[PDB]
Amino acid sequence: SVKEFLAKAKEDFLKKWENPAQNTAHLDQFERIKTLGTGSGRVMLVKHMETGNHYAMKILDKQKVVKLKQIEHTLNEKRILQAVNFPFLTKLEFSFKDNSNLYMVMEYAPGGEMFSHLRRIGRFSEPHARFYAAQIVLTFEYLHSLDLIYRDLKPENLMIDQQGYIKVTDFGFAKRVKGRTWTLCGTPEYLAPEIILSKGYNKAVDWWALGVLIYEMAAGYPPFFADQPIQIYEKIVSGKVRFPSHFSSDLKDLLRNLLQVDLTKRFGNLKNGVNDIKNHKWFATTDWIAIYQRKVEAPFIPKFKGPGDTSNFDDYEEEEIRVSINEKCGKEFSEF
Template sequence: MGPTNSTKRSQTEIHTFLEKEKERFIEKIENPIRQNANLDDFELTRTIGTGSFGRVVLVKHRKDSEKENIALKILDKQVIVKMKQIDHTLAEKKILQALSCPFIVKLLYTFKYNSYLYLGLEYAPGGELFTHLRAIGRYTEDMSRFYSAQMVLAFEYLHHLGVIYRDLKPENLLFASDGYLKMTDFGFAKRVKDRTWTLCGTPEYLAPEIILSRGYNKGVDYWALGVLMYEMSAGYPPFFADQPIQIYEKIVSGRVRFPNHFSVELKDLLKNLLQVDLTRRYGNLKSGVRDIKEHRWYKDVDFIAIFQKAVPAPFIPRTDKENYEMYDEQPLTVSPSERFPREFLEF
């Protein structure tokens, strides 16, 4: 069988696989899991992350020994309501519980109790890509290729389901024990049929169409992919400045300067991802993600082998040491009665 027929066959197999995943996703979206645990089921160990709406605590399940460590995301209802993030929070839980991808954290448990909402997530012990990248300085192109290929596959999966992620950045990519990545934090994820207009994301990673308040779609994820690939390979993002407004001006200008050590192939791919003109941006064209997967920078990458985790990772995190920052522990202040029952009825 020639390479052309082989490519067609693999494309057909991928499409068939994604269509089955879409059916499974829709079934789970229409019949989401509700309360499948409570706080007494877990033994709290320590805080491994904090955010605007709460924190993430490393916990152990008291009864299920197979799930040795779980990252329990604890969200404060009052803060969510105050910051008008109810819809984003409900969407995060609804979407995450329906996803099944090797490069996305699994939602294992979900429950609510009085003051808080709880999401029990698969624990990635290797810490953030952000921390690892800062420690090394910058990745080789081979490393950037390996990690970015996983994000290409994650986006191919999400976009086939009609979901855009909108929050790709090194802080939201965690190392599993096998050295592969897990995408986390789906607070900005959204099911989109055509376009959406919400301004959300991290300044350095925002696509021009978001900044210019134009309707946007999956193209914003591929712009962010370009930013990530650049940052991994350079050690710094393509657009940075002291103030967000200055960052936005640079992004909208579309002018990108490349370090001398970038290969010709990497520069070419980045020019097509960091493309202000949506009608020319890779991932957003007629061939979709194939323009990226078949680009010459990825010529030696077997995406199916990456998906199956058959390619040895260039870095295996040590799991016998702490890979997350230490935080001051604070007790949970739980209300004696259910807070905002109507607002979080669907959680």
Template sequence: VYSFKDNSHLYIALEFASGGEMFTHLRSVGKYPEDQTRFYAAQVTLAFEYLHYLNILYRDLKPENILFSADGYLKITDFGFAKVVRDRTYTLCGTPEYIAPEIILSRGYNKSVDYWALGVLIYEMAAGFPPFYADQPIQIYEKIVQGKFKFPSHFSAELKDLIRNLLQTDLTKRYGNLKNGTKDIKYQKWFATTNWIAIFEKRVKPVHVPKADRDHFEKYDEKPLSNSATELYPSEFENF
């Protein structure tokens, strides 16, 4: 939200997402029903649509990096791997279960990797586990490159179709990476009941509104901060 400093410390103030991580909540409930999965997937799709408009690749989508606000809507956090890319980039980064095949094969990649990760996230939200998993990262990578996975029996036909088109190893066929951009995702049958403008304006009632537990604030023992009489890091923060 903002930042400031004194002679001894640098302070960064962040928005408080009181609902915690999606990872923790998803593990506690096991999996999400499709309507809840769709609600969250729509928000991530809109976030990627905006980031890619700015030529920013996110590259680290996973439940651990998605937070719940007090109103039940999502916030994507941890932009440590985010990068402005106007053509291609080649860095190997991300979480093994969510890495796209073109990253593993070092062929260069663009925004397509975020839509692959979106497919993995949608699968994991609806199933309770990712489509590609194994004991060792190299085994996960082999499965990803092959692009072979199985659907749980409770997945609807429309959900399966969307995931197949997102977890498409052929970049010329992957949703989000085609000439229609995110329209291929937003107008796919699984999203037929989604009001995208209402989601954007937060007019859709969330399926889950987190109950904020503020007990740890009461128990936290604040330590007094000492401040130096002179600036300790003048060169490091010369232009701050």
């Protein structure tokens, strides 16, 4: 059963959650290759010299974290990621910190961001979109079972692996919470109405975000867009959404239910929970265990080149990894 799987998963998670791994590597053990992404921190392709394995290494500047008031969120991110284990999550292999920076070393996904492939091709076919959506459904089922809310769903945070399956990455806003929370965080296009209206909110905001994602994947643009976030928020709270003429009746109905301003009627947040989504007609052809097992053929598979090939990633300016001779923010990140 799923019940049976999730019960063991939670046992496994709980042990790691209460006794997090710490200081499992050092910077000098990795060769820095290429920056795969940057904002606020940055992610680099690196090579672990002792194995020759390639990984993606997230580097956070401790001082910058403090200034953005993201200390607790960063502590959440590392504690959660070292504890979880699921096929469609980027696995934390090592973590450490030095005088200046925090480091999280994860499994490398050479297929690049879904964002890149989605924007290029324009839009995905309903089957292509359904393939990805199912993996997000299963990942959220897993996360929510562990009382984890994710809060950062978008194509920019979904990596494609060499088999064409996805990895959900960026746990910067992930948090273990039973009951309601209040932090204003996320990405404008993906924010549930509760969040915009400074209400307390729960894991329903993740099922709403799934609605935005499926819509964007299938249409090629989000359901609520404008040049400024304010304008986007007005549309989200309006209570109106328009679907392209090419959207199937089943898709439109799924989305109306996921993109429901009314929490009592929003799929994923009803009495039956995630089964309302799983048993929808749009997922009728979905073999959920086959998705989990990865037996299903990927509708798109990234072009194989070398093991540390970066052509599915954009080019970013390469800045130094500077390490001060003085320890910064030791107290703040003691448990990291």
